[PDB]
Design a protein around this ligand. Sequence first.
Ligand SMILES: *[C@@H]1O[C@H](CO)[C@@H](O[C@@H]2O[C@H](CO)[C@@H](O[C@@H]3O[C@H](CO[C@H]4O[C@H](CO[C@H]5O[C@H](CO)[C@@H](O)[C@H](O)[C@@H]5O)[C@@H](O)[C@H](O[C@H]5O[C@H](CO)[C@@H](O)[C@H](O)[C@@H]5O)[C@@H]4O)[C@@H](O)[C@H](O[C@H]4O[C@H](CO)[C@@H](O)[C@H](O)[C@@H]4O[C@H]4O[C@H](CO)[C@@H](O)[C@H](O)[C@@H]4O)[C@@H]3O)[C@H](O)[C@H]2NC(C)=O)[C@H](O)[C@H]1NC(C)=O
Ligand SMILES: *[C@@H]1O[C@H](CO)[C@@H](O[C@@H]2O[C@H](CO)[C@@H](O[C@@H]3O[C@H](CO[C@H]4O[C@H](CO)[C@@H](O)[C@H](O)[C@@H]4O)[C@@H](O)[C@H](O[C@H]4O[C@H](CO)[C@@H](O)[C@H](O)[C@@H]4O[C@H]4O[C@H](CO)[C@@H](O)[C@H](O)[C@@H]4O)[C@@H]3O)[C@H](O)[C@H]2NC(C)=O)[C@H](O)[C@H]1NC(C)=O
Ligand SMILES: *[C@@H]1O[C@H](CO)[C@@H](O[C@@H]2O[C@H](CO)[C@@H](O[C@@H]3O[C@H](CO)[C@@H](O)[C@H](O)[C@@H]3O)[C@H](O)[C@H]2NC(C)=O)[C@H](O)[C@H]1NC(C)=O
Ligand SMILES: *[C@@H]1O[C@H](CO)[C@@H](O[C@@H]2O[C@H](CO)[C@@H](O)[C@H](O)[C@H]2NC(C)=O)[C@H](O)[C@H]1NC(C)=O
Ligand SMILES: *[C@@H]1O[C@H](CO)[C@@H](O[C@@H]2O[C@H](CO)[C@@H](O)[C@H](O)[C@H]2NC(C)=O)[C@H](O)[C@H]1NC(C)=O
Ligand SMILES: *[C@@H]1O[C@H](CO)[C@@H](O[C@@H]2O[C@H](CO)[C@@H](O)[C@H](O)[C@H]2NC(C)=O)[C@H](O)[C@H]1NC(C)=O
Ligand SMILES: *[C@@H]1O[C@H](CO)[C@@H](O[C@@H]2O[C@H](CO)[C@@H](O)[C@H](O)[C@H]2NC(C)=O)[C@H](O)[C@H]1NC(C)=O
Ligand SMILES: *[C@@H]1O[C@H](CO)[C@@H](O[C@@H]2O[C@H](CO)[C@@H](O)[C@H](O)[C@H]2NC(C)=O)[C@H](O)[C@H]1NC(C)=O
Ligand SMILES: *[C@@H]1O[C@H](CO)[C@@H](O[C@@H]2O[C@H](CO)[C@@H](O)[C@H](O)[C@H]2NC(C)=O)[C@H](O)[C@H]1NC(C)=O
Ligand SMILES: *[C@@H]1O[C@H](CO)[C@@H](O[C@@H]2O[C@H](CO)[C@@H](O)[C@H](O)[C@H]2NC(C)=O)[C@H](O)[C@H]1NC(C)=O
Ligand SMILES: *[C@@H]1O[C@H](CO)[C@@H](O[C@@H]2O[C@H](CO)[C@@H](O)[C@H](O)[C@H]2NC(C)=O)[C@H](O)[C@H]1NC(C)=O
Ligand SMILES: *[C@@H]1O[C@H](CO)[C@@H](O[C@@H]2O[C@H](CO)[C@@H](O)[C@H](O)[C@H]2NC(C)=O)[C@H](O)[C@H]1NC(C)=O
Ligand SMILES: *[C@@H]1O[C@H](CO)[C@@H](O[C@@H]2O[C@H](CO)[C@@H](O)[C@H](O)[C@H]2NC(C)=O)[C@H](O)[C@H]1NC(C)=O
Ligand SMILES: *[C@@H]1O[C@H](CO)[C@@H](O[C@@H]2O[C@H](CO)[C@@H](O)[C@H](O)[C@H]2NC(C)=O)[C@H](O)[C@H]1NC(C)=O
Ligand SMILES: *[C@@H]1O[C@H](CO)[C@@H](O[C@@H]2O[C@H](CO)[C@@H](O)[C@H](O)[C@H]2NC(C)=O)[C@H](O)[C@H]1NC(C)=O
Ligand SMILES: *[C@@H]1O[C@H](CO)[C@@H](O)[C@H](O)[C@H]1NC(C)=O
Ligand SMILES: *[C@@H]1O[C@H](CO)[C@@H](O)[C@H](O)[C@H]1NC(C)=O
Ligand SMILES: *[C@@H]1O[C@H](CO)[C@@H](O)[C@H](O)[C@H]1NC(C)=O
Ligand SMILES: *[C@@H]1O[C@H](CO)[C@@H](O)[C@H](O)[C@H]1NC(C)=O
Ligand SMILES: *[C@@H]1O[C@H](CO)[C@@H](O)[C@H](O)[C@H]1NC(C)=O
Ligand SMILES: *[C@@H]1O[C@H](CO)[C@@H](O)[C@H](O)[C@H]1NC(C)=O
Ligand SMILES: *[C@@H]1O[C@H](CO)[C@@H](O)[C@H](O)[C@H]1NC(C)=O
Lengths: 146, 146, 146, 120, 123, 450
Amino acid sequence: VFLGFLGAAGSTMGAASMTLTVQARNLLSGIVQQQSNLLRAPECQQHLLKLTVWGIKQLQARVLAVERYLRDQQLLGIWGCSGKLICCTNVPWNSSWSNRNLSEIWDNMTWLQWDKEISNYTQIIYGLLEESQNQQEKNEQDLLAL
Amino acid sequence: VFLGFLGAAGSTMGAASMTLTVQARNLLSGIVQQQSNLLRAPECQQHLLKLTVWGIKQLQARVLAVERYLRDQQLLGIWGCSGKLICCTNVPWNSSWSNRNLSEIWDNMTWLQWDKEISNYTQIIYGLLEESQNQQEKNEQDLLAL
Amino acid sequence: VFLGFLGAAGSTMGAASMTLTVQARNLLSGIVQQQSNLLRAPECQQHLLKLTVWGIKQLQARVLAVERYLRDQQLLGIWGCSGKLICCTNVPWNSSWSNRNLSEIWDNMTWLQWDKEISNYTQIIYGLLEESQNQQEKNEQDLLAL
Amino acid sequence: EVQLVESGPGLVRPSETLSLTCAVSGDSISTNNGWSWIRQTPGKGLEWIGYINGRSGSTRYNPSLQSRVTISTDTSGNQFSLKVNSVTAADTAKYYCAFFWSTYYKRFDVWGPGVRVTVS
Amino acid sequence: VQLIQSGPQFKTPGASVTVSCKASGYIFTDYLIHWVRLVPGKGLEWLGRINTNAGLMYLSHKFEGRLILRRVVDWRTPSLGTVNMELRNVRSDDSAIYFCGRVVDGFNAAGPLEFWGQGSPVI
Amino acid sequence: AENLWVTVYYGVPVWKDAETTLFCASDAKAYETKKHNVWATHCCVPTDPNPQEIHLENVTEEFNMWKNNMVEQMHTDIISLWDQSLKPCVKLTPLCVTLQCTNVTNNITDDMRGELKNCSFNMTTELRDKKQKVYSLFYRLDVVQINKEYRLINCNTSAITQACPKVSFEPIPIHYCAPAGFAILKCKDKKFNGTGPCPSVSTVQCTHGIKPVVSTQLLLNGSLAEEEVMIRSENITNNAKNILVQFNTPVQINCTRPNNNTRKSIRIGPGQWFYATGDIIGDIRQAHCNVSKATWNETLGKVVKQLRKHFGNNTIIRFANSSGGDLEVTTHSFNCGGEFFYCNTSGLFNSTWISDSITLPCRIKQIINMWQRIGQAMYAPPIQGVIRCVSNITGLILTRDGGSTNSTTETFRPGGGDMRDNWRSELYKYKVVKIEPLGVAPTRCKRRVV
Ligand SMILES: *[C@@H]1O[C@H](CO)[C@@H](O[C@@H]2O[C@H](CO)[C@@H](O[C@@H]3O[C@H](CO[C@H]4O[C@H](CO[C@H]5O[C@H](CO)[C@@H](O)[C@H](O)[C@@H]5O)[C@@H](O)[C@H](O[C@H]5O[C@H](CO)[C@@H](O)[C@H](O)[C@@H]5O)[C@@H]4O)[C@@H](O)[C@H](O[C@H]4O[C@H](CO)[C@@H](O)[C@H](O)[C@@H]4O[C@H]4O[C@H](CO)[C@@H](O)[C@H](O)[C@@H]4O)[C@@H]3O)[C@H](O)[C@H]2NC(C)=O)[C@H](O)[C@H]1NC(C)=O
Ligand SMILES: *[C@@H]1O[C@H](CO)[C@@H](O[C@@H]2O[C@H](CO)[C@@H](O[C@@H]3O[C@H](CO[C@H]4O[C@H](CO)[C@@H](O)[C@H](O)[C@@H]4O)[C@@H](O)[C@H](O[C@H]4O[C@H](CO)[C@@H](O)[C@H](O)[C@@H]4O[C@H]4O[C@H](CO)[C@@H](O)[C@H](O)[C@@H]4O)[C@@H]3O)[C@H](O)[C@H]2NC(C)=O)[C@H](O)[C@H]1NC(C)=O
Ligand SMILES: *[C@@H]1O[C@H](CO)[C@@H](O[C@@H]2O[C@H](CO)[C@@H](O[C@@H]3O[C@H](CO)[C@@H](O)[C@H](O)[C@@H]3O)[C@H](O)[C@H]2NC(C)=O)[C@H](O)[C@H]1NC(C)=O
Ligand SMILES: *[C@@H]1O[C@H](CO)[C@@H](O[C@@H]2O[C@H](CO)[C@@H](O)[C@H](O)[C@H]2NC(C)=O)[C@H](O)[C@H]1NC(C)=O
Ligand SMILES: *[C@@H]1O[C@H](CO)[C@@H](O[C@@H]2O[C@H](CO)[C@@H](O)[C@H](O)[C@H]2NC(C)=O)[C@H](O)[C@H]1NC(C)=O
Ligand SMILES: *[C@@H]1O[C@H](CO)[C@@H](O[C@@H]2O[C@H](CO)[C@@H](O)[C@H](O)[C@H]2NC(C)=O)[C@H](O)[C@H]1NC(C)=O
Ligand SMILES: *[C@@H]1O[C@H](CO)[C@@H](O[C@@H]2O[C@H](CO)[C@@H](O)[C@H](O)[C@H]2NC(C)=O)[C@H](O)[C@H]1NC(C)=O
Ligand SMILES: *[C@@H]1O[C@H](CO)[C@@H](O[C@@H]2O[C@H](CO)[C@@H](O)[C@H](O)[C@H]2NC(C)=O)[C@H](O)[C@H]1NC(C)=O
Ligand SMILES: *[C@@H]1O[C@H](CO)[C@@H](O[C@@H]2O[C@H](CO)[C@@H](O)[C@H](O)[C@H]2NC(C)=O)[C@H](O)[C@H]1NC(C)=O
Ligand SMILES: *[C@@H]1O[C@H](CO)[C@@H](O[C@@H]2O[C@H](CO)[C@@H](O)[C@H](O)[C@H]2NC(C)=O)[C@H](O)[C@H]1NC(C)=O
Ligand SMILES: *[C@@H]1O[C@H](CO)[C@@H](O[C@@H]2O[C@H](CO)[C@@H](O)[C@H](O)[C@H]2NC(C)=O)[C@H](O)[C@H]1NC(C)=O
Ligand SMILES: *[C@@H]1O[C@H](CO)[C@@H](O[C@@H]2O[C@H](CO)[C@@H](O)[C@H](O)[C@H]2NC(C)=O)[C@H](O)[C@H]1NC(C)=O
Ligand SMILES: *[C@@H]1O[C@H](CO)[C@@H](O[C@@H]2O[C@H](CO)[C@@H](O)[C@H](O)[C@H]2NC(C)=O)[C@H](O)[C@H]1NC(C)=O
Ligand SMILES: *[C@@H]1O[C@H](CO)[C@@H](O[C@@H]2O[C@H](CO)[C@@H](O)[C@H](O)[C@H]2NC(C)=O)[C@H](O)[C@H]1NC(C)=O
Ligand SMILES: *[C@@H]1O[C@H](CO)[C@@H](O[C@@H]2O[C@H](CO)[C@@H](O)[C@H](O)[C@H]2NC(C)=O)[C@H](O)[C@H]1NC(C)=O
Ligand SMILES: *[C@@H]1O[C@H](CO)[C@@H](O)[C@H](O)[C@H]1NC(C)=O
Ligand SMILES: *[C@@H]1O[C@H](CO)[C@@H](O)[C@H](O)[C@H]1NC(C)=O
Ligand SMILES: *[C@@H]1O[C@H](CO)[C@@H](O)[C@H](O)[C@H]1NC(C)=O
Ligand SMILES: *[C@@H]1O[C@H](CO)[C@@H](O)[C@H](O)[C@H]1NC(C)=O
Ligand SMILES: *[C@@H]1O[C@H](CO)[C@@H](O)[C@H](O)[C@H]1NC(C)=O
Ligand SMILES: *[C@@H]1O[C@H](CO)[C@@H](O)[C@H](O)[C@H]1NC(C)=O
Ligand SMILES: *[C@@H]1O[C@H](CO)[C@@H](O)[C@H](O)[C@H]1NC(C)=O
């Protein structure tokens, strides 16, 4: 855990796609989330009760990490990707959002650069992914299929 | 998000089944759960620390939304529906719980009316769904299958 | 719910594998997590606000149950088991971790005894399960498959 | 509610292609997937030929005719048709136009009267 | 349902006398509270009534310049509350047993009294 | 009997009535620069970005404004905010000492005779071995004559705190907003009487803006009825319940506190300050409120027209003034430009209906018990200069006396009652429900085991 947490950040999209579990494992487990799960009492705890302001700040940090995690999982569920780090969809690429070939982006760009190129199309793409899944379920409820 | 949140409430069960992502998206995202995830500090936060009672009420609301969400997801997992908004099971309908044909309920009833008709059979049905999944796993652990 | 919560604890691994939903259902639902979800206000709540230390202790207990649940679910997701109480993997057994035949462990050992026999190989096994899933995804991204 | 009306040659010779059509009245064939052809052969009974999905144009054909039959639509005429290549005496049968609705909520068929086709 | 009154009082003529009635076991608001004076040599006389929710006083037209009714409530505890009475310029003519009582359910627009206290008395 | 199987659906638009905690929000525009406003600090979450409202076709829902937990919650939170903002203030314990008081006779009108007392006393100082002789003016209603010797009223029961001079309890509008998993349903029918099967319902993210104005008798600065004056009550024939009357047009009322007034601060301790009332500049006259006479005639004609629908169209309806043994049950209490007013409304509720302006004299107080507590008291610092407020009367709180005589008449008076009746006048349209997304139903599918 955290042995190369953002190690692929400067690498290409292709190479970086091979380290996806590395970042996923660090979204729900900060130091305080490890101390909170010791078999022994952590001892510190009395401090956070005697002084309730510190107790509240710690809980807010823990609750937020959980809420952010769950929201990303909910979107993957809605889009039809329950689990999987990499999933294919039926939404075609518009070639307006970005107009580059596969041999250019997977080999020459980093994920940070990509993110800064299509950031204002994010909501359009997410909207289409949701519509696609709804259409798929409508087709599933037809026993003659395709 | 929230552009027709309960819009299908007065519609029939059939039509309403086509809007399921609309309600699902609003279970983990109230206004305070959006403000809490800004890149900038929300600014308000000092108020909730200076006066710890308000800080606690806000956390209780956030924790509860998460717990309710997770409990529903756990039941779907137990019943054998990981993900999916609509899933088929192997539990037969009893015709005691409700005794109507498909052409009557999917076209003439709303979900609110349905809920008020079979509410005291809810636990029986949930119990059967769990038993069904356990039986399925017992059959899966047999390499000769069916 | 909780009608035989650890009832299989003294039973064999084989028999105990048939009660897995029994323990799973009790990880997110303690008494306070039921009182918190009443349609009526619980009434007690004012106590936990007037005296903020008790309010904080209760939230810490609730947040922790959620964090522990989610971490186990994240590991199952990473290892390629989204949902399911029982899942097969591609990691071979080393026969160093434990060197017993199937007819000995499934019929004569309890899960507690097993846990005390291979506890210091837990991290090795978990590491291998993650590597296996990453290798599987690398193979999936090849349209000629196997 | 729809009505299905078949029409076509009542006689085809060996190795010729048989072409039958079906008009649909009361609803559209650009949608309502499940437009199909069924064959009733004396001495064999009923079998499927195949069907078409009006919304996408995709088709499925019973394997026995996988290399012999084409099903397509005329959505302007709101009619659909069946063509079977290399027709032989063994293909003499009563041919039917049918609409099969099978979903999670409803099940029904509509059948036309059919066309009897003699094959020499 | 219980109405508890304060003990007997004696006052110098011309002085005011204050008596009270503590009510409990029913919602204090709702159910108007009435005061009745008993004179052994004359019979019962109505003095007035109070609306315990609004804090409004209605008096018999003999005592407008002499009798004031008040109520005390606490929204926290609906089953408890009090009604106080102040009678000014007390004279020997006012020797009486002063009673507290509560109107029969459904008769707030009227005044039959179902529940009664003990009687002060005063002088 | 069809061969059907159970199908599980998630995200089903179903709900149950529920109680919960709403989080409150505000419109972060002009209110954002208020800085020391209590409500602008608490209801910090920004809202009203052209908020959503969603019409629910074919939804009929049961409403009951008299059992609406949103009002109880609003009441509790208002009280808590007041206690929290006063809690860290000076605590004027040292003022409950014998005061030596004389009458103010300096250019007082007849209606102000005996209203103001000029009191001197021995106060503590910042250095703890000294005493100082100081004086302040007090209103008659704030002191008790004992044994020219006076004491403050709140000596027998409680310490008196002082509102912090920078804290502004101005009732800027706030909105109540549902937490995730819950929704607020709004009743849109015009002429909705507070209860029953409302056929036109929409969901909202938050309530409309509500100003948490606190008053008795006359409801100020609320919303107006859409078409006709509305009369709502839990039970109209039970003369124990209050009647809430919502106007469909405002009545404008102009309130003032004349007398130029000055303020001085006195150290009572090491950084601990008390605010005293100094000599009044100019002459001394009574506070008062002005209500247009023609308007407060036309609007009673409307109230009476509607009352007849419940009491008989051959019934005589008369209005009369409040009668009781206290100030808090006979006057129109409100906070104006920071000071507390207790105005006499007998000039308004005086008419019989058989089928220029009105001046209301008004008194003011500095020591306020607030809400319904026995202990706990607040001293409201005086405000320099003169005070003028322009407010809208949006509704009345009325009660009936009971029946009368065989002439068939009814008498209505300004009522009292709990502060909650002020919130019931705005929140009557809203209900809170819990969303329950799982459900099951028969279908023709069966899980295909593979
Ligand atoms: C909304 O609020 C109102 C209050 O404003 C609630 O209404 C009240 O409801 C209760 C029931 O819960 C009624 O109690 C019963 O009253 C009858 C007497 O009724 C007759 O006389 C009335 C006399 O009123 C006079 O004074 C008024 C006020 O100044 C004048 O205006 C009148 O003109 C009179 O001078 C009269 O008002 C009644 O008429 C009204 O009501 C009837 C309907 O009842 C209408 O048709 C009329 O048009 C008019 O509106 C009427 O003429 C008593 O007899 C009852 O006592 C019996 O039942 C009791 C049950 O607990 C029992 O304990 C008693 O011992 C007694 O039992 C006898 O009868 C039994 C029958 O089963 C037998 O088995 C038994 O052996 C025995 O013989 C009872 O006290 C209130 O009167 C009524 N109040 C008002 C003002 O109307 C309303 O319910 C609330 N609504 C909601 C939804 O909450
Ligand atoms: C029903 O709804 C109405 C409409 O909203 C509402 O009326 C309004 O009430 C508010 C609050 O009392 C009034 O606001 C005050 O107005 C005075 C007068 O200012 C005039 O002149 C200036 C230019 O000099 C103009 O900009 C202004 O618009 C006016 O024409 C101000 O002096 C007040 O400011 C002081 O008090 C504030 C308290 O919140 C402080 O925040 C502010 O900083 C000021 O305090 C400082 O200066 C003081 C003087 O030196 C000093 O004593 C203090 O210690 C401190 O240093 C304030 O803005 C508003 O004008 C009313 N509107 C109308 C049309 O009359 C009703 O009140 C409401 N009814 C009910 C029952 O709630
Ligand atoms: C409330 O009472 C106080 C006294 O406790 C009043 O203040 C006093 O006012 C008198 C004048 O009426 C002052 O006396 C004069 O002082 C000037 C110098 O400034 C001198 O030249 C004159 O010959 C005369 O002595 C007196 O000093 C002053 N005392 C204090 C402590 O200020 C106050 O005006 C009264 N207020 C009201 C509203 O009645
Ligand atoms: C940082 O950039 C350098 C230069 O592009 C990357 O170097 C490549 O490394 C691979 C693996 O050893 C070689 O096969 C390539 O030929 C190298 N590129 C060049 C131009 O020589 C380096 O890998 C990048 N860092 C990371 C973490 O990806
Ligand atoms: C509310 O109820 C009405 C009446 O049942 C629904 O009206 C139907 O609307 C569809 C779509 O336009 C038409 O094809 C039907 O013929 C209409 N029904 C009738 C009897 O005319 C309306 O859709 C319902 N509202 C919602 C949100 O479903
Ligand atoms: C506790 O241990 C006993 C002894 O091993 C178990 O007894 C077995 O019960 C099964 C089911 O009735 C029988 O078929 C076996 O023959 C019994 N074993 C023997 C040696 O007689 C008992 O089941 C165990 N408890 C639990 C919960 O598993
Ligand atoms: C402030 O305290 C002084 C005493 O320290 C008070 O003056 C005395 O009052 C008593 C009566 O209570 C007289 O018998 C003494 O002769 C007075 N002494 C002097 C020096 O005057 C004074 O009255 C107190 N002031 C206030 C405003 O209460
Ligand atoms: C609000 O209006 C409704 C009707 O729209 C009133 O309810 C009815 O009252 C009559 C008696 O006057 C009963 O006979 C009906 O059965 C009631 N109908 C329903 C659906 O309950 C209701 O009482 C009015 N509310 C108020 C406070 O006056
Ligand atoms: C309420 O109305 C009265 C009139 O009845 C106003 O008093 C007048 O004010 C003007 C301007 O200062 C004077 O010239 C008149 O002589 C006053 N008339 C009387 C009878 O005193 C009063 O100012 C109004 N109050 C408010 C708050 O606007
Ligand atoms: C309350 O005060 C307003 C002023 O703010 C008065 O309205 C003015 O009335 C005069 C006529 O007397 C008009 O010429 C002005 O143009 C009005 N001013 C505004 C801003 O509208 C109002 O009449 C007063 N109300 C009462 C009951 O006295
Ligand atoms: C309600 O109005 C009546 C007048 O109709 C007021 O009665 C006067 O009260 C004063 C004492 O406060 C007496 O000196 C007068 O003689 C009374 N007038 C008459 C005609 O008798 C009554 O005080 C008003 N109530 C309130 C609370 O203001
Ligand atoms: C409330 O206002 C009314 C009207 O001004 C007051 O009633 C008048 O009081 C004076 C004495 O100051 C009498 O001379 C009048 O005759 C009374 N008017 C009537 C119609 O009776 C009333 O006193 C005020 N209420 C209080 C508690 O002071
Ligand atoms: C209530 O209304 C009555 C009138 O119906 C007022 O009494 C009149 O007052 C005028 C002076 O303004 C006298 O000339 C009349 O002779 C009086 N008439 C009667 C019948 O008394 C009364 O003052 C009003 N009450 C209040 C509090 O203003
Ligand atoms: C209260 O009195 C003060 C002092 O006389 C008034 O303030 C003065 O106003 C004039 C203009 O008329 C200025 O030139 C002075 O500089 C001001 N003096 C001070 C110390 O501020 C004030 O306006 C009066 N207020 C009212 C409402 O009448
Ligand atoms: C008294 O009520 C009037 C009428 O509603 C208010 O004036 C309106 O305010 C709205 C904004 O809420 C504007 O869009 C309208 O154009 C205004 N109408 C007119 C005729 O000016 C008035 O602000 C209210 N007064 C108070 C003190 O709240
Ligand atoms: C959208 O993103 C592109 C990225 O190349 C940027 O140049 C453009 O300015 C963005 N549009 C807006 C309105 O910011
Ligand atoms: C069970 O539900 C039905 C719904 O039609 C209802 O009529 C019945 O009273 C309910 N049973 C109990 C015990 O509440
Ligand atoms: C590893 O586990 C075995 C279990 O049989 C135990 O005997 C051994 O001592 C453990 N090793 C260490 C270093 O604790
Ligand atoms: C007090 O009244 C007199 C007239 O009797 C006047 O000359 C003096 O200026 C007035 N004082 C004040 C402060 O108005
Ligand atoms: C002061 O007030 C009293 C009433 O408490 C009164 O009797 C006395 O005459 C008043 N004195 C002056 C100068 O107004
Ligand atoms: C309590 O208040 C009364 C006046 O209502 C007063 O006479 C009494 O002395 C006060 N009690 C004490 C201890 O001062
Ligand atoms: C108020 O309305 C009544 C209606 O009967 C009328 O007699 C009275 O003169 C009106 N008052 C005013 C000031 O117009």
